[PDB]
Structure formats: structure tokens, C-alpha cells
Amino acid sequence: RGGISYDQLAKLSYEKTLRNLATQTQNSSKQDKVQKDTKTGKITIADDDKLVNKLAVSLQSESKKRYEARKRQMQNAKTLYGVESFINDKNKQFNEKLSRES
Amino acid sequence: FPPEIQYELWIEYLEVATSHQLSPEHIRFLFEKALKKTIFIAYSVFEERLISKSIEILRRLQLWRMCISKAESTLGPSVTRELYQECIQ
Amino acid sequence: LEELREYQRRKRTEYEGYLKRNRLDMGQWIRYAQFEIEQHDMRRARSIFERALLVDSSFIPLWIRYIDAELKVKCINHARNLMNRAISTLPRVDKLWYKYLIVEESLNNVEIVRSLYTKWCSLEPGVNAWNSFVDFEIRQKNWNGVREIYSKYVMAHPQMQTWLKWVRFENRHGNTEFTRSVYSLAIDTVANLQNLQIWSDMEVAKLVNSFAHWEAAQQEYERSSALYQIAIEKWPXXXXXXXXXXXXXXXXXXXXXXXXXXXXXXXXXXXXXXXXXXXX
Amino acid sequence: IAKNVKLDDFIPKRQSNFELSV
Amino acid sequence: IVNRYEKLLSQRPEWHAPWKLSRVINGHLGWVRCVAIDPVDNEWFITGSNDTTMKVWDLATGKLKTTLAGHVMTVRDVAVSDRHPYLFSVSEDKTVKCWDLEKNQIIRDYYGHLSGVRTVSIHPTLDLIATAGRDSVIKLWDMRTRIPVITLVGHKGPINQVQCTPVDPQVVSSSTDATVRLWDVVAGKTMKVLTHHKRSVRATALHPKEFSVASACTDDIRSWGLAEGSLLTNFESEKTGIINTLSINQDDVLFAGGDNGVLSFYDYKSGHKYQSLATREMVGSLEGERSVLCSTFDKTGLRLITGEADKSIKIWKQDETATKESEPGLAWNPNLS
């Protein structure tokens, strides 16, 4: 119905990021090599400083978002269920896992 | 147009083509193609006039149950008591 | 600075003491490897991750995170050389390829991924992997490239449903001859493939239709008639076949018993009547 | 990546022929 | 390439006969962990046990000869020498003991394992022993001086099994890290690493003739050619896991006992499964206790001995009628990926 194997999931996330990237490109349109040494085989590739900073900012931003959304599930999670007796948070959390087991 | 608009075509197409030739196998096949509720009733109305075959088709919701029972009564009373046992489930 | 120094020192005593005891529990390594990142020292953090690859190199959350800390500060040829070591160690994986592919998208270099997918196809990975390669050249063009993609692609999955996407998209090129060229090759190759292969599933009612509707686009009366004869050959005014298709389907209806077969005898006899008269 | 692994490595040798001589 | 797979229907592998149950020997108070047979005369076999003993069973009549005490914990593995009148036993009590057969007493303890030792392999030509265990290393013992001469560092996890071969790689080892390593002992380093298994490798057997090795895992039984180390064949398996034991007959028959009780015979050359059985557990046992913890073929190769978790030894005999009247096995379908 159902679970998903770690392959299909990987693909889905790949597609998701493809779409997001394509949108950065379109909005950027709206607002508007290989060298190997002879001494050592060390390969070097020319880079644009832009889009690399944009990359780092994307990763950091998405990490922030994920961390925050999970945090909100943290908040609601504990405030919702007050039915059964509990000694500490960890107890309540475990018994909500027992709610997941049903 | 597939099973949605196709029905909108198909109800008139059946009523008309049956009205035309009125050969068994061709029109039988046409209902076969067709089948993929009222279709069962047109088709059944055709078959009666093999009969048992039609009864098997109706065998194949309350109103539907009521009809089959009627046609079976038309084939004689004995089946109808039998029909109800099917009817309960 | 001592308000700093003794902070860093006391942390490095606590984290190592735990990892000293538990070699496993990667949850601690990533945490402690993250601590040394936020101190803006890459040398220590790289050591930690490298120290944690020894314990288990099959744990992808560790591999992934150690791509992040390289990409976040933008150390390129490290996170580049790393991917040499990364996907040569665990070449089967899914996540590791896409995170190497998708990071090459944001670097705009399509020569890399061109050669990436070369190997990653050379490895014969599977369905979801190939589809990212065929659909990537939709972003690009390679209309002469994409045809050769499916050349190899149905060599990896010599199965009918993949041919369906060849015949699908090769029309979208806008060339009828290149598309037609392989249907005659679907005669030659598939038949030679399928008949000599007992039995890989190739000839199904869905392959014959692929020949059929093709000639409908070219509006051929004969080239459809060739198909039926050629197909019906190897299978296990103009309402003549209307009767033949109905009569065959009528007899084709199975009849177990006496009355069932006699009921079918009423059907096919009426079909024969309306339309080897002695053998029937 | 390149020099580390090859497609053949995955594939078995005998599967093609059952008479291979070891 | 598939043109060959078209021709791959031309082999039609090597018919073999079906196997049936000849005799069942009770008599062990624990499980039967391991079984070794007299390598010269096929007169009797030895049986490790959970209950710490070893019993020598008469092979012809199935009667009991003598019992050998001397370990305080279970006896995981046992080896009997071709060239010596020695029995080497090993236990979970960290000990490797020799047994001089003539007098039937302990002779030489071999010391210096850290923790339980689950495997013993006698080198064929050198008068060495190879043992390994949860310690994640192999120790090569001088049989005469009881010295741990060579220590082969390697697997990152507990070693399940150890084999010895006269030429290069002389030591084949299979651990729970899903790696079968091929060792070069004189340089003390690994010749080749075979990683293809998905999970722990719990059984390995050597072919008596062809000079190759079979390995096993949950669902997968592979083979490997030694020397080069290449993959050779695969063995067709539906989910049979867990594969505890492999044994290879002289006739290219390959037995794989399971933890589900299902015995699975193969054809070594092809990789085809020509039979499957299930043992009939015992009178008062549990369905959990139906399984196979060990196995061997005697030197003739016509009789299989497998000790089972129900505290019984079962001698599986090959049918004399056979041929193609009605043998036919599971009948060769080469499914595709």
C-alpha cells in the first residue's frame, strides 16, 4: 500500500530535487572543463563559484526545514495524547509506538 | 474516450443497433465488448427473445435481485424459491 | 580562548571515551564528526569520518553525511575524489549514484554525467536506474544518442515492455523511417530471439498490436494483412471477419459437460447458418 | 570508479558452459 | 550475449538419482553439532554434541562404540586426520584438544584463543592445524610443538568456517561479514577477497576433485574457483534460508541442509536443484527443532550423515532403482533477471 524499498525512494527523491533545481533555473531566467597534469595524473575541473554557494545554501536550507518539521511533530506528538498514565516523556513516546503497533 | 464518455456513446449505440438487425453471434459479441448496469438489462432483454444463458448472465443491487427473480419465475416457479437462497447473501 | 580551549578539549575526552568503548553506534561518530566541523576545522572532521569508514563502510548515512560536510564548505575535488572511492566500494547502491548525479547537475557539467551513466549503464543496474539515463537526454538532446541508448537498453532487458518505450519515443523524434526500421528488425530479431529462446516472453498480443497500429498511421490495407497472416502463422461488403472473429470466439468459449457443449452448439450453428460446411 | 570494478566480475564463468575444466 | 543464453538450453545437466532416508540413530542428549568420518576405512564416524560429549558410531550397523568426554562446553567442530591417528576436537570453552586414537585419551591442548572456537581444519600435507572463532582471526598451529606459528588477521567479524588446500590459497575462511577470504600464509596476507554474499556466510565446502569451493548464505549458494578466485557457477535457490551446512559428494552432488528442515540436493556442475526433502522431525519434538546442523558424505559418497537439532543422526541413502523410470527432478527452468 505501502512501504517502499530504499531504491524506489532514492529515485523519487532524485526526481524531486531535479524539479526544484529546474525551478531555480527558470526563476533565474525570469530575473534576467578537464585539465590533467603531465607530472601527475591529477585531474582538475574548472568551477563557477556561483551555483556552488547556491548548492551549499540549498543543502543547509533543506536540512533546516527537515529538522524543523520533525521538530513540530515532536511538539504536537507529546501534546496530543494524555489518556493513559505515564511517568515520563519516554514512557508516553513508547506507548505511542504501541499505538503504531496496532 | 474509455469507460466514462464511452458509456454516453454506448447506451444510444446499443439501443439503436439492437433496433436495426434485431444474427445472434454478432450482437452477442457486441454486448461482450460493451460490458467492459443497464447494459445487463438490455442484453438480458435480448437473450430472452438461449434463455438459461441470460439467467446465468443476471446471475453473473436489490433491484437487480428483484429482476432476476422475475425472469426466473417467467421460466417457471421452482427456481424462484432457489433464487432467494442466493438472494440472502 | 580558554573559555574555548577547555571546551573543545573536554568534549574530545567525552566523545572519544564513548567511541573508545563502542566501536559501533555510528550515531555517535556522525555527531562527534559534526562537532569538529562546527569548530571550522576540516582536518579533524575528515579524520573522524575516515576513522568511521573502517568500522563499517556499508552504512550509507555515514557516506552521505561525509559528502555534505565536503559540499557545504565547497571543497570540490575532495568530494570529487571521494566519489571515486565511494561508488567503487559499494557499486550496487542506488542512493550513492543519484547523490553523485544530482550534485553534478547543480555543477552544470553534463560531460561528467555523460560518462557517469556510461559506467552506471555498463554495470547493468536495472529499471529505475536506466530510466534516469533515458529521461536525462530529454533534458539534453542527443537524439542520435538516445536511439543508441535504447540500443544497449533492450540488451540489458531483452523484454517486450521495454521495446514499448522504444517504439513510443522514436515516433516523438519525428522520424518514421528510423522507427519503422526496427519493426522489420522486430520481425527478424525478436523471432530469432524468442523462437531460439525457450521461452523468454516476447510474442504477446501486445507485440502484434505494435505492428498493427503502426500501419494505421501509414494507412496501409496490405501491410496490416501481412501482419495477421505473419502473426496467425506463428500463433499457438467487408463484414466477413466479423463472422470469423465471432464464430472463433464462440467455439473458443470452453464447455465442460454435456449441456454446456450443447448450448455452445446452438451458438456456433446459428453463427455458421447466418454466415468446411461438412466438417462443421 | 573506473579502475576498481568491471562488469564481468559480477558475472559467473560456468553458467554459460557446464563443461568448464577446473 | 543472449544468443548464448539461447544455446544455454543445450546443456540439459547431468541427471542424478534421488535420496531417501535409510536409518535414524538416536542417542545424543543434546543437539548434534558436528560430524566427521574416518578418512581411510569408512568404518565409523564421530559426532560433536551440545551435551559436551563425542560419540563414535559404528557406520555399518549404526551401533555405538565408545563415548569420548573431555570438554566442559559444546563441541562445535571435529576433524580426523588422514595421515595421523589423531582426532582434533574444538569447543566453545576456548580449547583445541588433540585425541590420540590408539589409546583414546587427550594428548595435546592448544592454547591461546581469546574466545570460543567454532572451526578446525587440518592442513593436508604440512602437519598443521587451522582453527578460528569469535576472535575474528585464524591461528595456524604447529601440530608437534603446539605453537601458534601464524596468525592471519582479516575478517572484521566472527569466523564461521575454515578449510585447507595444498597449493595456494592454503586457507579459505568464511566469516559473518559476508566475505570469503583466500589466504597466502607465507606472506600472512589475503590473496583475494570474495564479497559477493549478501549476509553472513555460515557454510563452506571443498570439492573433492575439481579444486573449487562452495559457499553459502541465506538465500544464496555460490561456488568459487580457487587460484584466480573467480565466481564459476551459481546455485538456483528459492528462499531456503538459512543454509547451515554444505557437503559435496564425489559425484558432483551438493547437499545443503537448512534451518527449516528442508534438505536440498543440487548438481555441482550446473547449479540445478534436483530434489528437495523435509525430515520428519521426531515423536515429541517441536516444529522449531526440525533442522540440520551438519552433514557429510562418507568416502564412497553414496551415504549422507546429517545430525539434526532433534538429537538424532540420520543416514540418508541413495536409491538403487532410480534412472528415469520416475526420477525426474525439479526439471530445469532457467528463469531470468
CB of D4 less than 8 A from some CB of E? no
Of the candidates A76, A84, A80, A72, the one whose C-alpha atom is nearest the C-alpha of residue A98 is A84
- Could you give the CA distance from residue E83 to residue E161 in angstroms, rounded to a whole number? 22
Q: Are E248 and E198 in contact (CB under 8 A)?
A: no
* A20 CB neighbour count, 10 Å cutoff: 12
**In this structure, which amino acid lies at residue C137?**
E
- Could you give the CA distance from residue E337 to residue E332 in angstroms, rounded to a whole number? 16
* E317 CB neighbour count, 10 Å cutoff: 13
Q: Which residues of D touch C (CB under 8 A)?
A: 1-2, 4-5, 7, 10
What residues are paired with E46 via a beta bridge?
A: E36, E56
| Residue A13, min C-alpha distance to chain C (Å) | 9
Contacts of B23 in chain C (CB under 8 A): 270-271, 274
C71/A59 CB distance under 8 A? yes
E2/C193 CB distance under 8 A? yes
C200/E9 CB distance under 8 A? no
Of the candidates E103, E109, E63, E65, the one whose C-alpha atom is nearest the C-alpha of residue E90 is E109
- Could you give the CA distance from residue C201 to residue C163 in angstroms, rounded to a whole number? 12
B25/C246 CB distance under 8 A? yes
Q: How would you class C126 by CB atoms within 10 Å of its CB: exposed for 0-12, middle for 13-18, buried for 19 or more? A: middle
Q: Give the three-state DSSP class for E11.
A: coil
CB of A26 less than 8 A from some CB of C? no
Measured CA to CA in angstroms, residue E46 lies from E120, E146, E223 at distances of 14, 23, 27
User: How many interchain CB pairs under 8 A, A with C?
Assistant: 54
- Could you give the CA distance from residue E225 to residue E165 in angstroms, rounded to a whole number? 13
Chains A and D share 3 or more Cβ pairs within 8 Å: no
Which CATH fold would you assign to the domain E1-337?
Answer: Methylamine Dehydrogenase; Chain H (2.130.10)
CB of E193 less than 8 A from some CB of D? no
Q: Sheet harboring E203-206: ordered strands across?
A: E203-206, E212-216, E221-225, E234-235
- Resolution of the solved structure (Å): 3.5
D7/C124 CB distance under 8 A? yes
The radius of gyration of chain B from alpha carbons, rounded to an integer in Å, stands at: 14
CB of C175 less than 8 A from some CB of E? no
CB of C255 less than 8 A from some CB of B? no
CB of E212 less than 8 A from some CB of D? yes
User: How many interchain CB pairs under 8 A, D with E?
Assistant: 35
CB of D6 less than 8 A from some CB of E? no
| Residue C241, min C-alpha distance to chain B (Å) | 11
Residues 6+ apart with CB under 8 A from E272: E13, E14, E236, E266, E329, E330, E332
The string over C140-166, giving b where at least 16 C-beta atoms fall within 10 Å of a residue's C-beta and e elsewhere, is eeeeeebbebbeebbebbbebebbeeb
Q: Are C82 and C70 in contact (CB under 8 A)?
A: yes
B25/C271 CB distance under 8 A? yes
- C215: part of which helix (H) or strand (E)? helix C205-217
Q: What is the largest CA-CA distance in chain E?
A: 64
Q: Rounded to the nearest 5°, which phi and psi values hold at C156?
A: -80, -40
CB of C176 less than 8 A from some CB of E? no
Contacts of C155 in chain E (CB under 8 A): 1-2
* A8 CB neighbour count, 10 Å cutoff: 13
CA C162 to chain CA centroid, nearest Å: 9
Q: Is C249 left (phi over 0), alpha (psi -120 to 50) or beta?
A: alpha
Contacts of D14 in chain E (CB under 8 A): 223, 232-233, 269, 271
A45/C132 CB distance under 8 A? no
CA E1 to chain CA centroid, nearest Å: 36
Measured CA to CA in angstroms, residue E58 lies from A67, E40, E84, E249 at distances of 69, 14, 20, 21
Listed by start position, the domains of chain E span 1-337
B23/C267 CB distance under 8 A? no
| Residue E235, min C-alpha distance to chain D (Å) | 10
CB of C64 less than 8 A from some CB of E? no
Q: Give the three-state DSSP class for B40.
A: helix
CB of A12 less than 8 A from some CB of C? no
| Residues of C (93-112) whose Cβ lies below 8 Å from A | 94-95, 98, 101-103, 105-109, 111
Residues 6+ apart with CB under 8 A from E136: E154, E155, E156, E157, E158, E159, E175
Of the candidates E240, E168, E154, E231, the one whose C-alpha atom is nearest the C-alpha of residue E197 is E231
Measured CA to CA in angstroms, residue C87 lies from A74, C6, C161 at distances of 35, 39, 30
Residues 6+ apart with CB under 8 A from C219: none
